[PDB]
């Protein structure tokens, strides 16, 4: 099934009647407007393109504005696509709301994780540090060795080294849907999802069991 595009509002808790507290993430899913439908004839695959949110008219370009005008839709903050399974059909201009997840029990949420900048090998790869005392010389959080001698005489591809951490697409799988609230456009999932507050989230029904 297709998913929806939301926005991370924050985390909170839900107290249950038997004294359990469920940590939930609040995801604001406003209506997603279908702006283009792709089919096997013209495009080679089946998918829908949706937009959501609002954009100020002075910041939408002419190429983008004419794309929305052909669909008969108001400009949103972006465009996303979802592959259509066999037996699903949509129409341009149709709106899709969070009630689509009314009977869904688990979801998968993908977003962009928080950016940690340039991180070292201890933070990025859980490398053990070396001794703090006992004679150590300027080598307290350095990576250590990176290869063997003359054979192979080089460093291997995929060696674990310091570099840019975070700020990338991450998917978290099999999160329970605690509450769908169509009147306030909310979806509450159990647990934590990637990103900062106010970031875009794509929520889809779980592919595994």
């Amino acid at each position: 099934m297709i998913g929806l595009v939301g926005k991370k509002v924050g985390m909170t808790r839900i107290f249950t009647e038997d004294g359990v507290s469920i940590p939930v993430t609040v995801i604001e899913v406003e209506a997603n407007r279908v702006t283009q439908v792709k089919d096997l004839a013209n495009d080679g695959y089946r998918a829908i393109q949706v937009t959501t949110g609002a954009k100020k008219a002075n910041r939408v370009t002419k190429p983008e504005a004419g794309h929305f005008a052909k669909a008969g839709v108001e400009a949103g903050r972006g465009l996303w696509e979802f592959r259509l399974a066999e037996g699903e059909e949509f129409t341009v201009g149709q709106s899709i709301s969070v009630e689509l997840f009314a009977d869904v029990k688990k979801v998968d949420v993908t977003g962009t994780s928080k950016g940690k900048g340039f991180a070292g090998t201890v933070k990025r790869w859980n490398f053990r540090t070396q001794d703090a005392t006992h004679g150590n010389s300027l080598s307290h959080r350095v990576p250590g060795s990176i290869g063997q001698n003359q054979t192979p005489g080089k460093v291997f591809k995929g060696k674990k080294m310091a570099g840019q951490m975070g700020n990338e697409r991450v998917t978290v799988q099999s999160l329970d849907v605690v509450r769908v609230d169509a009147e306030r456009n909310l979806l509450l999932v159990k647990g934590a999802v990637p990103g900062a507050t106010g970031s875009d989230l794509i929520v889809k029904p779980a592919v595994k069991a």
Binding site: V9, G10, T12, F15, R184
Partner: protein, 114 residues
Amino acid sequence: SNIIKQLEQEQMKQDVPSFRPGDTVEVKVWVVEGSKKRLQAFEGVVIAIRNRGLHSAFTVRKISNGEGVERVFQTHSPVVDSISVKRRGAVRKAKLYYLRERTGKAARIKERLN
């Protein structure tokens, strides 16, 4: 965070009594022992309060059977049945973590009287 705050108001208890650190309080908590649900009492001195709306919490310290026990309750959880103040104590601080090292006659808190 208008959305979060109004999701938060609908869960908060409305009958929470006023208390501050140093007070002797008695908290009754629902315990489930198999099939039946029962109330059990925990009485001690409030040593810390965290005020954050629904995420408010408070810590109670009691000396039971020879060993001190600190329990951190969540104010608005339905495990907490009732809170009642037995005595009002007079302290200058907001956190009474210094009571952890004191014992017996050195841990006495003077009463407020006003």
